Amino acid sequence: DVYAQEKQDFVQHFSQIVRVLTEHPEIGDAIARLKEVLEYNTIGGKYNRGLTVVVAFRELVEPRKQDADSLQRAWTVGWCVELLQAFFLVADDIMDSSLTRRGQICWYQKPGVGLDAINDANLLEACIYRLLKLYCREQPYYLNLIELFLQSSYQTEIGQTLDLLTAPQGNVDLVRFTEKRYKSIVKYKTAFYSFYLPIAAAMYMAGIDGEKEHANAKKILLEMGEFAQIQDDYLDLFGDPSVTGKIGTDIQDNKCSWLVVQCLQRATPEQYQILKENYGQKEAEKVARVKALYEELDLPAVFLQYEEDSYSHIMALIEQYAAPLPPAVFLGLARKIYK
Amino acid sequence: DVYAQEKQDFVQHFSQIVRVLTEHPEIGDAIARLKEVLEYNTIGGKYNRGLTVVVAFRELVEPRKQDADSLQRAWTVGWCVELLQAFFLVADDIMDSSLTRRGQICWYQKPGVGLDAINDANLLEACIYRLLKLYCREQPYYLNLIELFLQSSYQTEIGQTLDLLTAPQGNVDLVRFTEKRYKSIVKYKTAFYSFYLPIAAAMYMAGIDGEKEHANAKKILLEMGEFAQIQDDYLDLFGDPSVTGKIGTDIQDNKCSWLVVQCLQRATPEQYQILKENYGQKEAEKVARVKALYEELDLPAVFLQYEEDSYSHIMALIEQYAAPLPPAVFLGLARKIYK
Numbered sequence: 001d002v003y004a005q006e007k008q009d010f011v012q013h014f015s016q017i018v019r020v021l022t023e024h025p026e027i028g029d030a031i032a033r034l035k036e037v038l039e040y041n042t043i044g045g046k047y048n049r050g051l052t053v054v055v056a057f058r059e060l061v062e063p064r065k066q067d068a069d070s071l072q073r074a075w076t077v078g079w080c081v082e083l084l085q086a087f088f089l090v091a092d093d094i095m096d097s098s099l100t101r102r103g104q105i106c107w108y109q110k111p112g113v114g115l116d117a118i119n120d121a122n123l124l125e126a127c128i129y130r131l132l133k134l135y136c137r138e139q140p141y142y143l144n145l146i147e148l149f150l151q152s153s154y155q156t157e158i159g160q161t162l163d164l165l166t167a168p169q170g171n172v173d174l175v176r177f178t179e180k181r182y183k184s185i186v187k188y189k190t191a192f193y194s195f196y197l198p199i200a201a202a203m204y205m206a207g208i209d210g211e212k213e214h215a216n217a218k219k220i221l222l223e224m225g226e227f228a229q230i231q232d233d234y235l236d237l238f239g240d241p242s243v244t245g246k247i248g249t250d251i252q253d254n255k256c257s258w259l260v261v262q263c264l265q266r267a268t269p270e271q272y273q274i275l276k277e278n279y280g281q282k283e284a285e286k287v288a289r290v291k292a293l294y295e296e297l298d299l300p301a302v303f304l305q306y307e308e309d310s311y312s313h314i315m316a317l318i319e320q321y322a323a324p325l326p327p328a329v330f331l332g333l334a335r336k337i338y339k
Numbered sequence: 340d341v342y343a344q345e346k347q348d349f350v351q352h353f354s355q356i357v358r359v360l361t362e363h364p365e366i367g368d369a370i371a372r373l374k375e376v377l378e379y380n381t382i383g384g385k386y387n388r389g390l391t392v393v394v395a396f397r398e399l400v401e402p403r404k405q406d407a408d409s410l411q412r413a414w415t416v417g418w419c420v421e422l423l424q425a426f427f428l429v430a431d432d433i434m435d436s437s438l439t440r441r442g443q444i445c446w447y448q449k450p451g452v453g454l455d456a457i458n459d460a461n462l463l464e465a466c467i468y469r470l471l472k473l474y475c476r477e478q479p480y481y482l483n484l485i486e487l488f489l490q491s492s493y494q495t496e497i498g499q500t501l502d503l504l505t506a507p508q509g510n511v512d513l514v515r516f517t518e519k520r521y522k523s524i525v526k527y528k529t530a531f532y533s534f535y536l537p538i539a540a541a542m543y544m545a546g547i548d549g550e551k552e553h554a555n556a557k558k559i560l561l562e563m564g565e566f567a568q569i570q571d572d573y574l575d576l577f578g579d580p581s582v583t584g585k586i587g588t589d590i591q592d593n594k595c596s597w598l599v600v601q602c603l604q605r606a607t608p609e610q611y612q613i614l615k616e617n618y619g620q621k622e623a624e625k626v627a628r629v630k631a632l633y634e635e636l637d638l639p640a641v642f643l644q645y646e647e648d649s650y651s652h653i654m655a656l657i658e659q660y661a662a663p664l665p666p667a668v669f670l671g672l673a674r675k676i677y678k
């Protein structure tokens with residue numbers, strides 16, 4: 001695996017990122033806190049979004065053009081994608097009332113952190129533009145990268161607004177949980193930043209700035225993003241937290257999950273009433289009742305059939321839109337998403 | 340007053356900003372929520388930071404160069420400074436546990452908003468870069484403006500970290516409340532975004548990009564920022580909430596206020612013990628005890644003498660560093676700050 005090898009080399013570069021971001025004695029205490037925020041929240045994941053930048057860069061740039069400075073800028077932009085994700089996740093954990101992430105308690109759940117995590121999240125986002133300035137300022141793709149990260153943040157935030165508006169706390173929202181609504185939330189809240197952003201960053205760094213090539217890449221990557229969020233929704237309830245590193249909250253949070261959308265399409269009038277009575281509530285027995293209904297409607301089997309259909313669809317889109325990019329750019333990512 | 344006239348003309352342009360930011364039917368609901376966030380949080384203030392952009396622009400640019408498009412870009416950048424402030428304040432109200440702002444309950448205290456305000460704050464920040472792209476993309480100062488707003492956000496966030504680290508909830512922190520600590524917090528948390536950012540934005544728009552001229556402007560503006568935060572700290576306890584539009588929380592939040600720093604410099608060993616026992620706690624009787632101690636040490640009189648000394652100092656800095664900029668750029672702002 002092209003990711004599995006480059007993984008340890010990627011993590012080894014974190015130490016330099018922290019040193020450069022921690023490099024005015026008056027702000028000493030604030031800088032020591034930023035280092036703590038970085039070390040707790042940006043390290044511990046699979047680093048698939050950040051590694052995608054590095055792997056795509058090595059596949060798109062001519063090896064004679066892959067000098068020490070060029071590769072350093074590639075790893076740094078990969079770490080900017082990981083920082084963007086860390087910004088979103090620190091805040092998403094507060095708004096989703098989550099307990100754990102990447103095998104440890106959520107940063108905001110830590111004694112002595114609490115709602116100060118809001119500012120900590122904003123500092124993580126600020127660090128992206130600090131790194132882009134320090135390493136890419138004199139490059140011709142500088143403005144393209146800045147605008148890509150800003151645009152990806154706007155899209156994600158619009159997606160999170162849709163996610164939160166469809167999931168009001170204390171209100172029965174089954175009418176809102178439609179396939180059309182689900183597809184819009186997922187496109188904006190995760191597909192852009194998770195798949196389009198790292199490949200587009202590598203494309204701009206390789207000097208591929210054409211509107212058509214970015215549109216063709218986006219066509220594959222947004223569909224891959226849709227499947228990744230469906231899988232994330234499935235694992236929220238049916239995944240092993242020792243593997244996922246987090247505890248699911250979608251049922252309690254009244255979320256427009258892929259699971260609830262599939263339930264509503266297959267439920268009898270009686271089964272709809274069970275869902276209405278038990279969904280979007282904090283009671284453990286009500287959550288268990290929803291999971292029992294999902295297993296009764298064979299939703300894990302419906303998911304298994306969907307993964308197969310989605311995989312074939314994404315492969316047909318790679319055949320249609322990959323050119324002139326090497327298909328291996330999209331196949332490597334598809335190998336990581338589909339298990 | 341050059342601000343008092345241009346105030347109504349500034350507010351009249353908000354309608355266009357909202358229309359352009361609310362201009363894909365799938366994200367309809369999210370866009371309707373963004374409009375609600377903008378209308379609740381960006382309108383209702385004095386608009387002094389946003390007006391500073393417009394007034395400084397008209398004073399720095401030749402009237403023959405002040406065309407309809409140029410002025411439209413000036414009002415828009417003024418509204419970007421107001422959006423940046425709205426982003427910081429929506430989040431600062433959550434972390435300071437505030438109740439009201441600009442005469443109404445804090446956005447997060449609204450029933451049905453709560454911690455979703457975290458995402459709402461992030462959308463306000465995203466809107467800045469949406470407006471810069473839509474109006475300033477083809478201008479030579481585009482990258483300078485983007486970098487100025489990003490740098491101002493980083494500085495402010497570093498300042499807020501320092502503010503929160505010096506004010507731990509549940510801990511007696513009087514040792515930390517020094518003049519040197521206070522001056523660092525204030526420089527970063529408010530002075531850059533409140534005074535340096537709007538003048539620098541107008542300077543870049545007028546084609547004044549020289550390192551020396553920006554350094555000379557900053558020398559005046561950061562000192563003005565220091566006084567504005569001291570006045571804000573004084574009004575937190577001794578101001579009229581019908582005038583300030585907000586309720587003070589500095590004593591309850593264990594903040595390193597200018598007032599507590601002055602108290603600690605003038606307190607007898609007995610008075611220090613009263614402060615230690617009553618500061619940084621939510622009990623109304625303990626807050627009242629701290630205010631009684633402040634009035635006993637004549638801190639409102641100490642503030643009155645400070646405003647006079649600060650005013651003379653800022654005027655001496657205008658005489659020293661204003662040139663070649665018209666002194667009226669700094670005098671107009673000084674007239675607004677000093678009451």
Ligand SMILES: NCCC(O)(P(=O)(O)O)P(=O)(O)O
Nearest residue numbers: 089092096098189190232236
């Ligand atoms: N997309 C952000 C984070 C998530 O994927 P996560 O499962 O919390 O990591 P969400 O389900 O809240 O959308």
Ligand SMILES: NCCC(O)(P(=O)(O)O)P(=O)(O)O
Nearest residue numbers: 428431435437528529571575
């Ligand atoms: N500077 C941000 C907001 C304040 O000025 P405000 O008094 O809450 O408006 P703070 O005192 O929290 O610093």
Ligand SMILES: [Mg+2]
Nearest residue numbers: 092093096098
């Ligand atoms: Mg979540």
Ligand SMILES: [Mg+2]
Nearest residue numbers: 092093096163
């Ligand atoms: Mg979420």
Ligand SMILES: [Mg+2]
Nearest residue numbers: 232233236250
């Ligand atoms: Mg999830």
Ligand SMILES: [Mg+2]
Nearest residue numbers: 431432435437
């Ligand atoms: Mg405050």
Ligand SMILES: [Mg+2]
Nearest residue numbers: 431432435502
């Ligand atoms: Mg504050």
Ligand SMILES: [Mg+2]
Nearest residue numbers: 571572575589
């Ligand atoms: Mg205050």
